């Protein structure tokens, strides 16, 4: 996987400490969570080729997360990989999202809550994962 060196976000659940770094700590038991329309931004160690994103949303069989994914080299000007996606509720395995490869230093997810409530909660994200999951092409 591509090294995530820094994570930032619009906000987070500070009472439970569901901080942005939890999205990239390699532990599916910790999560980032924020309410309302939110965003979480992943900075890689360098600009590099991106071919997949692994997303492990919280309570996936109960809650489908609505989100969009953007990429950038400067962290200021964004291009979409896909907009208005929902995560699957089929199982608890996460999903491997695929797309025409791009070059990026930053990946940003703009999130819109779930079909259950207005929290966005993600256990883990990884970039260029080898997870043994079927490819879900997103655009």
d(CA 131, CA 95): 9
Q: Is 30 in the site for Ca ion (CB under 5 A)?
A: yes
Calpha distance 15→92 (Å, rounded):
26
Q: Check binding of 115 to Ca ion (CB under 5 A).
A: no
Q: Is 129 in the site for Ca ion (CB under 5 A)?
A: no
In the complex, what is the shortest distance from the CB of residue 79 to Ca ion, in angstroms, rounded to a whole number?
Answer: 27
Question: Least distance in Å: CB of 29 to Ca ion?
Answer: 7
Does the protein bind Ca ion through residue 17 (CB under 5 A)? no
Closest CB to Ca ion among residues 55, 104:
55
CB-nearest residue to Ca ion: 30
Q: Between residues 58 and 106, which has the closer beta carbon with respect to Ca ion? A: 58
């Amino acid at each position: 996987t591509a090294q995530i060196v820094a994570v930032t976000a619009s906000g987070y659940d500070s009472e439970k400490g569901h901080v942005p770094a939890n999205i990239a700590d390699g532990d599916v038991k910790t999560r980032w969570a924020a309410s309302g329309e939110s965003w979480v931004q992943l900075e890689l160690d360098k600009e590099q080729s991106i071919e997949n994103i692994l997303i492990v949303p919280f309570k996936p069989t109960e809650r489908k997360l609505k989100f969009s994914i953007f990429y950038s080299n400067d962290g200021k000007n964004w291009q979409p990989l896909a907009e208005g996606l929902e995560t699957s509720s089929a199982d608890k395995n996460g999903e491997k999202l695929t797309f025409t490869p791009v070059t990026a230093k930053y990946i940003k997810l703009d999130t819109f809550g779930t079909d259950v409530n207005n929290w966005s909660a993600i256990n883990e994200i990884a970039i260029n994962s080898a997870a043994a999951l079927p490819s879900r092409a997103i655009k």
